[PDB]
Amino acid sequence: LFSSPDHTLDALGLRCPEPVMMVRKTVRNMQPGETLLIIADDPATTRDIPGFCTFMEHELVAKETDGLPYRYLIRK
Amino acid sequence: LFSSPDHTLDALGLRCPEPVMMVRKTVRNMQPGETLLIIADDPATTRDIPGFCTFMEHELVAKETDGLPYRYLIRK
Amino acid sequence: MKLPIYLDYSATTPVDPRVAEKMMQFMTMDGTFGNPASRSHRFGWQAEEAVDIARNQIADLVGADPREIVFTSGATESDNLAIKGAANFYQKKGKHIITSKTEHKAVLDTCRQLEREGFEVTYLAPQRNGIIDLKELEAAMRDDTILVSIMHVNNEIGVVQDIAAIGEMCRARGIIYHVDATQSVGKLPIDLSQLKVDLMSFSGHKIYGPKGIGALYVRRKPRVRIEAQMHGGGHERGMRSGTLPVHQIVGMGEAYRIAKEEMATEMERLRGLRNRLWNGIKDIEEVYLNGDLEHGAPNILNVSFNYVEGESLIMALKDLAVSSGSACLEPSYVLRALGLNDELAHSSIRFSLGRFTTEEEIDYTIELVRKSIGRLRDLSPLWEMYKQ
Amino acid sequence: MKLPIYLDYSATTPVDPRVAEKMMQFMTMDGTFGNPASRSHRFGWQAEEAVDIARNQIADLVGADPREIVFTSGATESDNLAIKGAANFYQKKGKHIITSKTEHKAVLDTCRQLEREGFEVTYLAPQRNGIIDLKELEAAMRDDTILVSIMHVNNEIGVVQDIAAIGEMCRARGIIYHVDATQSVGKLPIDLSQLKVDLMSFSGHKIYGPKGIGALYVRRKPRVRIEAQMHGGGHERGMRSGTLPVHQIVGMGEAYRIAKEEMATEMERLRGLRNRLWNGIKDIEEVYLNGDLEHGAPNILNVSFNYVEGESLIMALKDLAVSSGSACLEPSYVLRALGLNDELAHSSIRFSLGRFTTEEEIDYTIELVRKSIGRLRDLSPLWEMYKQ
Ligand SMILES: *Cc1c(COP(=O)(O)O)cnc(C)c1O
Ligand SMILES: *Cc1c(COP(=O)(O)O)cnc(C)c1O
């Protein structure tokens, strides 16, 4: 679900490329196997946050795209 | 003297940094121990062509500075 | 043979082991790390020599004189420098500029800024094959035209322009001709002693040199002039201030020297691999060639696959490293200029070849494309339509 | 101990073996050579990661946010970008700019170009010690002033300005404050979360990173804006287009991270060597200190030797690699601003210390200077005059 994320990244009002930058930094200060709730309203994140998990090899858990704010739960 | 140079570099009308560039290239296509008459009217060559021979390790043979065109005979 | 298979040499190339090795001799305390602008000691003087050896290496590739080569931080800068530099210097002769609607962004974005500054810019549409209509180019030229920028080789579709003839049209009218040769340098022959180009841009990382360096040709004779864009001490004969980056500069010049040597051999080999590739896929049903097969760069091949949803095309060729030329949702601005619709443009792949590309990789590529375009079409509501 | 002895760290520094080694991992086919702007494959994505790791490394040195760091080709570019970018963006608030007559050429030459474009620029004279009179700075500020550029540490004399206080004067009036921190970065502490600087320039090769790379701080909060000077695709959040040079970028960020670590230790060591040097030569008869001993960079020492013909001074210290700060016949424009006459300015040497400088080198230096200034004066018609 979207209930027990250990980390919460608010990225509201941020626009590409800023979201991927913020997310990039967070995963570094994160331990391998941790949760991260991303709150964004940048539409480009529908392509770019899955792209991150795909090309940087992370676990895209649960998604939200059908209404703002979008939510993206991710695990290292 | 200024009579039997095997190479003649005309650099008249050229202005720093152009003279040192032309001279630089000539010494490369030259065999170690060869003569090169430089004809320049760039006043900066009074400092820069001796500077070349000094910092690039070549033989400053005979000089001319007291009237234009200046003449500089050099040997590799 | 590893995966992905890099087919994006036009995005950027890898640095030659020979190039990178030279660049090592100009870094640390025991190398030639000195600033070539310090002339009170040996450090500076020998550094300046390294610069000069590279500046010549570059010059000899393109038939220029070393005194015509200006160091920049990249092809992007050369294009800004060349265009705004020339436009500003000659603005008293007129304010009109002409370029092509398929030029790289450095040229296009630069012209758009000049339009803010009071310049008028005509963007010519290309024909379907990508070539500019020279008579349409002529109909655009005016009394108050001062500059034309049309690139040698296009980086998306590979198409080659007649820069010689364009150069002749320019000179005869006193118009400055700028050429973006990033893609063509070290691929097609170039001799400025013969060509009527006044300004020409090029970079290093498209020819196995390092990113972050490039140069700008500026014609000595007849004399062309530009206003500097980069101020602070007046280096590069007043046209580009700033400390010269020696190692970067050395790596570039070495790359240009290898290019002079290996060019002929290499472009005949690539031109063959290019033809190997298009033949193993030209037989597929709905595939189109964007550009020119005869008169196009030997190393670029841009093909369109019809009746396939493009979003998934790339996800299907994950075994390949290529690009569609789309921009962080929407589709190559070059293919849209050629005239294709957004859906077709979206499902086009640009294959760009290079030094490390083999026949094994090409054949593997051929196979993957058949099986991939095959599977997508199987599951395509669009193909079933076409199959009526 | 080899000769020459490099004492020109302020001209440029050598690249750290640690820095250069990182820069190797981002070059050749088997490294991360991909273009960080290609997002359809793995090559690009991991390259972009390297960039981001370095962008942060940089940010953390100066208390910025990574989203505030803009990549450039060098400090020269940052100064052009910052100044013309800010001046052009805010030109509707007024056209007046203020800077100091002793700023680096990148700032000075940039302002002079803006004066061509219709901007008014006040160049403030420094006091004899190099510091700007803040009340003279205040008397210059107007309604229509939009920008102030005053550097943190001067590169000729080493003098440090009160950028904190200048920042306060700027903010209180809505004036943009640009700071050239090329010399100060990684030497004096810097924390933009506290400082009221809006734009700040820095480079890499003055801190043991590579030439040809540098950055520009742009304040996120309160929001500062600039017009891009480099067009073509809108990279770095629209402020500096062009392919990012990954290796260059990596080398810079590593250099900034080492700097955060080793800074304290190193600047206390240099500050001691600086004091070792001035003490072993302060006893010579006609020697003057240009700048400030207490409140000056720990690594720069600019001294004047009176009654000696300067042309030969340098030829006398050929065992040292330093600079007088003269320009391809005439004399440091900074020392002339401080007020010294052309002859004294000509016979001044700037000693700049760094990572590889020892006590052995300093002591050897001390000795050489006594014996050298001694011999020159022996043969000086000028000294005999002074000896009356
Ligand atoms: C890649 C490219 C450029 C960009 O050069 P950079 O060195 O990345 O700034 C410019 N023009 C063309 C045609 C290109 O293909
Ligand atoms: C050296 C220096 C510069 C120049 O930076 P580059 O990277 O060489 O372009 C700019 N400002 C100051 C204060 C400097 O000392």
Residue numbers in the entry:
A (entry chain B), B (entry chain B): 4 to 79
C (entry chain A), D (entry chain A): 1 to 328, 333 to 392
Task: List passages from the publication reporting this PDB structure.
The IscS-TusA complex crystallized in two forms with identical heterotetramers consisting of an IscS dimer and two TusA molecules. The distance between the two TusA monomers exceeds 40 Å. TusA interacts with the large domain of one IscS subunit within the dimer, with the exception of the tip of the loop containing the essential Cys328 of IscS, which comes from the other subunit. This persulfide-carrying Cys328IscS is juxtaposed against the acceptor cysteine of TusA, Cys19TusA, with only ∼4 Å separating their S atoms. The residues of TusA contacting IscS are located on two α-helices (α1TusA and α2TusA), which are nearly perpendicular to helix α2IscS. The interface involves van der Waals contacts, polar and hydrogen bond interactions, and salt bridges. IscS mutations that abrogated interaction with wild-type TusA, W45IscSR, E49IscSA, D52IscSR, D52IscSY, and D52IscSM (unpublished data) involved tightly clustered residues located on the side of helix α2IscS, in excellent agreement with the crystal structure. In the IscS-TusA complex, the observed proximity of Cys19TusA to persulfated Cys328IscS could be sufficient for sulfur transfer to occur. Asp51TusA is on the surface while Asp45TusA is buried but forms a hydrogen bond to the NH of Cys19TusA. As a result, the thiol groups of Cys328′IscS and Cys19TusA are in close proximity, within a distance of less than 4.5 Å. This organization of the IscS-TusA complex suggests that the dimerization of IscS is essential for effecting sulfur transfer to various acceptor proteins.
